[PDB]
Write a protein that binds this ligand. Structure first.
Ligand code: NA
Ligand code: NA
Lengths: 228, 225
């Protein structure tokens, strides 16, 4: 198409995140592999600035939409964007807490996808559960994909995180993916991507790091053909 | 006898809506029925005041969470609320347009659930697709249900409506359902309700007559173990 044809290969990825939270700079490098048919892959992410100043949990969406698994009959926008690439502009606004704003660029180097992300995490509560590292898991969710003009798609999500006291920190996620090239590209109709995420810490790597697994896949719902 | 045991049969409902959009007052009355196991049901609505002064599409969510079909390992909060009843306080904020704020109460009379709702639709664009009636389809959604303390559940959704010119009007839906009793109630863990809606214009004359069908069912999504 021929972006989806490229993704019939096994691929690797590398992510460079330049971040700040409340004025304190951080750097994360991440890398991984994803074999066809994709939709289930791990990432190894390391904080290169010593110790991450906030919970690793909200970093989950920063550390590969083209590795989601799409069925027959839904257009896979992120994959169609290649070989030219795509950018992402994203907001995650946490209730009673700060807002993460990011800019993502993706380029293809043969079968490696290289990602550069700058993120500003501002207005975060120093005595809240993100900065106190009191977030215990990431709730699986049904993200909503929408056409967004001729060259973009918008992803909306409610991303929950369970707190150590058994409460819930809710992030309002709004992400626009934009095609970088001049050709016309097939914009999918409204659909969903289900995303399941889990982070783990091992003795393997001694650096501050997570190993995160994501299962991601697209689906539609049966439409109803009359009101009887 | 309480909760889901009250919903094992065929049931009816009646809805009274007291509304305004940009200060224009309107009244809707609606009824329908829902047969066990529920999850697929019709409503028939009439604007008692004549012509609806806005699109009927954003009214879809006002004109029955207890008629969603719940499977066996998810507690069906809205059913569990009965006989005491349930309230809903809900906002739907539309991008580049108005906000609908509604307050619902639900009461069970035998096998009929009666609903009384006030809605305030404020700040709507007189030249936007809501007020100009240029919304065509209601997109299906995956609404997100969360526990919300020991007596409530919060439902979050992205409710989109396509416009005639192929655009999208997006509503941010935020809704709290609260038990009005003193008994301890089981609060379900995080889950989803899939909702598929279709609205039909009916033979009207003096009053708008609209029919709506909704398929709604709960499901809960993998975890990684
Ligand atoms: Na499509
Ligand atoms: Na449950």
């Amino acid at each position: 198409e021929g972006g989806p044809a490229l993704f019939q290969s096994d691929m690797t990825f590398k992510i460079f995140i330049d971040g700040e939270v409340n004025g304190q700079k951080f750097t994360i490098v991440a890398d991984g592999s994803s074999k066809f048919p994709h939709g289930d892959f791990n990432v190894h992410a390391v904080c290169e600035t010593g110790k991450l100043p906030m919970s690793w949990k909200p970093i989950c969406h920063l550390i590969e939409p083209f590795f989601a698994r799409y069925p027959d009959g839904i257009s896979h926008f992120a994959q169609e964007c290649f070989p030219e690439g795509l950018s992402i502009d994203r907001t995650v606004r946490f209730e009673n807490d700060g807002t993460m704003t990011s800019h993502h660029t993706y380029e293809l180097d043969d079968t490696c996808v290289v990602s550069r992300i700058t993120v500003n995490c501002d207005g975060f509560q120093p005595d809240g559960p993100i900065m106190r590292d009191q977030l215990v898991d990431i709730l699986p969710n049904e993200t909503h994909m929408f056409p967004h003009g001729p060259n973009a798609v918008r992803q909306l999500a409610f991303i929950g995180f369970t707190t150590a006291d058994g409460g819930l920190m809710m992030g309002h996620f709004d992400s626009k993916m934009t095609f970088n090239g001049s050709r016309a590209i097939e914009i999918p109709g409204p659909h969903f991507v289900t995303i399941i995420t889990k982070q783990m810490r091992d003795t393997s790597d001694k650096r501050d790091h997570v190993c995160q697994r994501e299962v991601a896949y697209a689906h539609s719902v049966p439409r109803i053909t009359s009101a009887i």
